[PDB]
Amino acid sequence: MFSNRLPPPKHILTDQIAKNVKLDDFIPKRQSNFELSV
Amino acid sequence: HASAFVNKIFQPEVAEELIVNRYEKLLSQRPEWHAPWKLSRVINGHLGWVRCVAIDPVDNEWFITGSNDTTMKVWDLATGKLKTTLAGHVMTVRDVAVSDRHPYLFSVSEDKTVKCWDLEKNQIIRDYYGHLSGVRTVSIHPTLDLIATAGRDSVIKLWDMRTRIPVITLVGHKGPINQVQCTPVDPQVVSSSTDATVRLWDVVAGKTMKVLTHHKRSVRATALHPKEFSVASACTDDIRSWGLAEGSLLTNFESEKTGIINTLSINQDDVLFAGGDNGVLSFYDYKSGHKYQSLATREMVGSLEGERSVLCSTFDKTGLRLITGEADKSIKIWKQDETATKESEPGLAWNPNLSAKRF
């Protein structure tokens, strides 16, 4: 914590827009762990 | 630790979703060490560009290469000497492939033809017919007596090998196909055209299992990994690795500011070569993506500056020897440099960049 070293002051259709595109098709799977059993 | 500090305060719904987590994991992840490469011998003897090279998949004693003077040549691997020459195309030879089940050399060319050479008598046995323009690609099926060829025709033809009938034609792309790889289980043909897609084909049904649209430009080179059941696809600076049988994105390779990548190759112990059109040949770890060596091919005596570019490459069967053929009509062999250890030649020190948002 950097802040505690300071003194105190004295004064509906959302899921329907694009169902085909998802975030997790962008992230590589061997990014997090290497040595993955493919 | 620090990710606990981020996760308890910012509270992502999925911890994998947030970018500081996906960047802290890569710094803690620590890739593997590989040895640096060097030049071993250089072999002259063609009268045009060395467009394509193939290796003996059994005995590892010779490597054949086709070229731009419309002749293929079988060179001795160990000594570098020229054993023999093969003519039979009238325009240049785009790709060669030697079978491992039968003594057959299937050569492909730009004059719209596909031929089958016997290696027991060194003659042409079987000619194949049906491509509207010049084929640029041969793979051979691992267990089923097929040929898969492709060109500017925008289709993949899967030739029977006995009756030489174009049995199955895969109609999917929107441009010439640059690479076709054959695969023994149900993503059986994996191709890559110049409309920035890579397709995984169901050859029994006739349709596509999955289209991979991640690249931005033409995919010029692909490679199968010998011990992994995964594929690597190259682009104009975008090398990715893909799993087969699902179609995942397994890893992105830090491959920026390298130019047009002509060829790829994959060693047994997770090395990935990627020779470029700017004469730069760069070596990657496969599981990580880290580029640990870059080299430049000094071209020739009275050559040009544009005439240095690796147009084709392969690895040895034992894997410790790289064979490239450059645009300066010459054949160059690269070597693992057995002396160096982890402390002597470390690499490029693994500093992944949060900027470019690709890691």
Next chain:
Amino acid sequence: RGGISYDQLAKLSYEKTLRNLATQTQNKVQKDTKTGKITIADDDKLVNKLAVSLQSESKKRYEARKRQMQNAKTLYGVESFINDKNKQFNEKLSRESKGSE
């Protein structure tokens, strides 16, 4: 400033159109589970204004290009030509060679 990208010209066009929409403003959802179709209940007005806005904007841009054609067709001070298309080609060569060196 030079050439501008597409991701930036897109935002500048969006912001100009919203600025226009604010000055123009100055002067539900039903899911049928039988088919799956969504009917959004929009008013008849603000559809007419959208259509007339697009029509008037396209006519304005069209007339601006039409007047630019005549004012670029009067000025003969470029180079010697033999038809109407050579004049445009020679003006293209002037525009590239003046900017290059």
Next chain:
Amino acid sequence: QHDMRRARSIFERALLVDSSFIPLWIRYIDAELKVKCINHARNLMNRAISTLPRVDKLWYKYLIVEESLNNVEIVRSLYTKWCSLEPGVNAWNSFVDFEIRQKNWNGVREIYSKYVMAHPQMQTWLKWVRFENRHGNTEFTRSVYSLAIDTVANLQNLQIWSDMEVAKLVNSFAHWEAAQQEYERSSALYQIAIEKWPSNQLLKAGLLDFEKQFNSIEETISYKRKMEYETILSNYDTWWLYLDLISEFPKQIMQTFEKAIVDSKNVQWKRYIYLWMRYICYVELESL
């Protein structure tokens, strides 16, 4: 010809040849809209942004159309999905501007709370700073500053931020606390930030600018050493050695003078003669 079905079939056949071409998508959306067929264009803009999600103009087209019909829930949902795909800062600044124009003051904090994680730089934290100074309390802006600075001090094991960027953050914290009459907290802040990072000299210059604006000999020594490094990089160095020996302690000045005597073709030889003469005179004032 007022035949809309043939025009639709022609535009679809036109897309099958070339889907990468954006003016064709825009004409077909406009050709739906001008004849007042809004649902056809909604289906079409859906198919456009789901076909090519990395194209900015298509999302902005669908946002214009839903604004022009006054459908604010749809525009919020569209920017929610559009921000969900990690787009880039134009999309985020558009959404914070949308939620400013709707005067939902509570929601803009949620947008910035995701936007400081989608893009970590100090320019995004400082944008949320300036919003909290304009439309928030002193306490919210104070908590936002604290949430900035503790994450900056924590996450240096990743090394996202450079030195000038951290210095810009700390200078903003300090000058705002000085505007809020908390001088003790500001000076203590510079103490802790100098303690945390020793080598960020931009932060030290910010400290000295604050203390001169609101000690002296250490400032002269630090500015003289910085100007000496700058004049060694420029070359000059003799006046640097003189100002260092006037400032110094003096053993380092003597060893640096010996290094400058090593560092010593007309003005070159003249400066060499002057430097060797001054070094020999300073040695003679203090045989071999």
